[PDB]
Amino acid sequence: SMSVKKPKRDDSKDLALCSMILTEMETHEDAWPFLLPVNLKLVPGYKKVIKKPMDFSTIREKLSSGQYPNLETFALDVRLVFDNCETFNEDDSDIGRAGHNMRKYFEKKWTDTFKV
Numbered sequence: 184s185m186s187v188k189k190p191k192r193d194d195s196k197d198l199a200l201c202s203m204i205l206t207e208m209e210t211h212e213d214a215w216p217f218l219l220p221v222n223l224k225l226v227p228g229y230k231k232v233i234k235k236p237m238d239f240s241t242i243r244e245k246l247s248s249g250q251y252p253n254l255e256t257f258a259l260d261v262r263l264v265f266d267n268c269e270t271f272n273e274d275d276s277d278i279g280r281a282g283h284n285m286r287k288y289f290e291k292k293w294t295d296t297f298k299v
C-alpha cells in the first residue's frame with residue numbers, strides 16, 4: 184500500500200530474456216503456423232471469429248518497440264497465439280498439434296526463466 188512495498192524484484196533483464204525466449208519460439212520447427220499474421224483475406228472465418236489475432240512477428244515488433252509494459256503482458260500475447268490456434272483448429276490437425284507443442288515449449292521456458 185502507500186509507503187509499504189514488497190521487496191524489489193530485479194526486472195532489469197526481462198526484456199533481454201523475453202527476446203531470447205521469443206527467438207527460441209521463432210526457431211522451433213513447429214513455429215511455421217505462428218511466424219506471420221494469419222492472412223485475413225485468404226482464410227474465411229478468421230477475421231470474424233478471432234477477435235484478437237496475434238503472431239510471433241507481431242510480438243517481436245511490440246517487444247522491440249517498447250509496447251510491453253512488463254513480462255506478463257508479453258506472456259499474455261504469446262498465450263493468445265495458442266488460444267487463437269485452439270479456437271480455429273482441430274486438435275487432430277497439424278496446426279492444432281503445432282499449437283499444443285509450442286504452448287508446452289513456451290511454458291517450460293517461461294517457468295525455468297522466471298519462476299526458477
Ligand SMILES: CC(=O)c1cc(-c2ncccn2)c2cc(N)ccn12
Binds near residue numbers: 217
Ligand atoms: C495459426 C493458424 O490458425 C493458421 C496458420 C496457417 C498457415 N498455413 C500455411 C502456412 C503458414 N500458416 C493457417 C492456414 C489456414 N487455412 C487456417 C489457419 N492457419
